[PDB]
Amino acid sequence: KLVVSTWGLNEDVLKETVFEPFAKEHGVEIVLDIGNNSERLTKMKNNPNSQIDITYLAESFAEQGVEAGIFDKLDYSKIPNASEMNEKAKSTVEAGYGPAYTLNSIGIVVDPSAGIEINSWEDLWKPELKNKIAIPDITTTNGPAMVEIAAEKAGVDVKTDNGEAAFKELEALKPNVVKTYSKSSDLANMFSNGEIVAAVASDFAFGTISKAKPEVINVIPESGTYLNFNTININKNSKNKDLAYEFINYALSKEVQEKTAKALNESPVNKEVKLSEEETKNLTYGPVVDNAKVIDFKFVNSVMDQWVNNWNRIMN
Ligand SMILES: [Cl-]
Ligand SMILES: [Cl-]
Incomplete structure (x- = not known):
């Protein structure tokens, strides 16, 4: 048995x-x-x-x-x-x-008809994206990845400063964030209603959003996705x-x-x-995996309480 x-x-x-x-x-x-x-x-x-x-x-x-x-x-x-x-x-x-x-894995799901070019993770910070993006909440599968993405933008690894610089980049992203999400279903409707032009989202979520808005594309930055x-x-x-x-x-x-x-x-x-x-x-299959980044959960879990506190203080 x-x-x-x-x-x-x-x-x-x-x-x-x-x-x-x-x-x-x-x-x-x-x-x-x-x-x-x-x-x-x-x-x-x-x-x-x-x-x-x-x-x-x-x-x-x-x-x-x-x-x-x-x-x-x-x-x-x-x-x-x-x-x-x-x-x-x-x-x-x-x-x-x-x-x-x-x-x-994750990617940047984008509605290309808005005509805003988004190729890299750093492009999510562009001033043209005011009130136009959705990102996963810290408590979701991809919350840690979102903090690491911000760390890349800052140029300081989270193991160097426990993510302080990453959180400063997240503060800087605030004007573009419509909401932090937890449900894939949530994204489909936001894209269908034109509430967002882009979202950091999972491979599964791209499938769901595509059914509601087939014109969306899945952008994988050259720097690498997160698994x-x-x-x-x-x-x-x-x-x-x-x-x-x-x-x-x-x-x-x-x-x-x-x-x-x-x-x-x-x-x-x-x-x-x-x-x-x-x-x-x-x-998620193919070359995308070869260039991807992985997260050290031994380290991340050791600072998760701090991260959640910082995230909530910043995003609300
Ligand atoms: Cl048990
Ligand atoms: Cl996980």
Whole structure:
């Protein structure tokens, strides 16, 4: 029996595509413990007798579990498929705990009919964009990326000054920000109503906005996009670790990565995957990944309370 802590979104497809084949191949039963990142993480951190074997989380939350001492540092000699991960995703392998099994990216979604040229992240600060952009809130997946983007503009890495210069650049961006968001649905309507001309948004969000306003384009600055990952960890209290390792190795396999890309719109971390143009629609795939930047969540989580305070003080 393998107990899996996960979101369980599109549960039927998820079971059909990922868990059932594994269960049948290994002659075992899979049980899901579902909920959102925060509730699942909170429960396992406070439960002395957790029965969870493996845990799926966004990297930001996974790092909090690592810090809490809930997850095992992994023996990658038992996960040979990790050798097939792209160089950016391998940053999670180097970290030593659970590896990324999927990735996502951001871009600048732009309505080109406004005739305002936007090519780089720094262009978001142009005076012509007064009252015309939306950015992700600090509490969302891409909040940290937004602070790092501001750090690039300032020319001071957040590890040098804990982000103070980045926050001064965020103050400077204020006249152009219509709102900080949290919902993808929110952006589609803002573009449809002409409330914004540009938004820093995820690959998934570009797809949603495009359905409402097909003329929008997705600009990826030459300096590089920012990636975020979801990872799989083995719980330290697990009594089924050999099977847990087999499962992670399976989740990273070329076949499972291809199946989940197609069935669940999960961008692959396995560089050997064969996918068509229609299949990679709205996924993050290709050269974009090679030039991308990754975030150090060990560092970011250590300054998150400060960042949230600073962000709210500045943006409201
Ligand atoms: Cl638990
Ligand atoms: Cl994350």
